């Protein structure tokens, strides 16, 4: 009974946590911005987030409307070279 990431954040704010007047962006960048305050920039993260920093958005990896808090994305969901999480 795990709650989605979008949920965990909601309880900590609402649907407006990554949505303006309930109007999801039609790109992804606009949202990716929201994930740049209480957290920071990938270029300011581990050596695992850096490598990506400037490639794919958070959600893109931390599928909010799908993933569930406490669920480390799988590299197999992109990398097929045995890539493993560190
Ligand atoms: C950030 C932590 C989010 C919160 C809080 C909620 N949603 Fe969300 N939603 C988020 C992203 C990043 C995206 C897409 C942009 C991307 O980077 O891919 C979305 C998209 C939606 C959609 C799209 C509908 C579709 O056509 O698939 C809907 C309908 C939506 N979001 C609704 C929604 C609701 C109801 C929320 C509160 C329960 C909510 N979102 C919170 C990120 C985040
Ligand atoms: C403040 C308004 C926030 C914004 C904007 C975003 N997140 Fe956030 N997130 C916030 C808090 C207070 C916390 C708790 C821990 C912490 O101090 O950061 C979190 C936690 C997450 C996590 C944790 C995942 C886990 O394994 O527990 C993730 C993956 C996460 N947040 C992702 C995320 C995304 C994708 C956002 C934009 C769509 C985003 N955060 C915005 C507060 C805030
Ligand atoms: C896939 C290429 C990812 C993208 C893009 C982002 N993150 Fe991530 N993140 C990823 C993994 C695989 C993990 C866990 C590693 C494992 O397998 O154990 C994480 C973890 C985090 C955490 C945990 C730290 C904490 O909650 O205290 C945070 C806070 C986090 N990721 C935030 C974050 C943000 C803000 C991103 C966009 C700027 C982002 N991640 C992108 C994989 C990926
Ligand atoms: C798709 C959503 C991805 C997921 C899931 C993860 N990564 Fe990724 N990463 C992605 C792309 C598109 C690229 C580069 C694209 C290209 O072909 O140029 C990368 C790159 C890396 C690298 C850099 C390798 C290098 O050349 O030095 C590393 C080290 C890396 N990715 C690690 C990694 C790990 C450990 C993941 C699972 C926790 C992971 N990535 C997931 C896109 C995506």
C-alpha distance from residue 82 to each of 31, 49, 73, 74, 76 (Å) = 30, 18, 14, 10, 7
Mutate to test the pocket of ligand 3, among 9, 29, 45, 55 (most ligand atoms within 8 A of CB): 45
For ligand 2, the distance from its centroid to the CA atom of residue 23, given in whole angstroms, is 20
Domain count, the chain: 1
Domain with residue 41: its CATH number is 1.10.1130.10
86: its two tokens: 């560190």
CB 31 within 8 Å of CB 59: yes
Sign of the dihedral defined by the CA atoms of residues 17, 76, 26, 30, in that order: positive
Ligand 2 binding pocket includes 64 (Cβ within 6 Å): yes
Method for this entry: NMR
Sign of the dihedral defined by the CA atoms of residues 35, 60, 64, 85, in that order: negative
Angle at 12 between CA 23 and CA 78, to 5 degrees: 65
* Residue-number span of the structural domain to which 84 is assigned: 1-86
């Amino acid at each position: 009974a795990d709650e989605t990431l979008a949920e965990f954040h909601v309880e900590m704010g609402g649907c407006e946590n990554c949505h303006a007047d309930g109007e999801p962006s039609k790109d992804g960048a606009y949202e990716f911005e929201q994930c740049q305050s209480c957290h920071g920039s990938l270029a300011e993260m581990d050596d695992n987030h850096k490598p990506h920093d400037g490639l794919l958005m958070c959600a893109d990896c931390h599928a909010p409307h799908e993933a569930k808090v406490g669920e480390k994305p799988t590299c197999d969901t992109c990398h097929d070279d045995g890539r493993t999480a560190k």
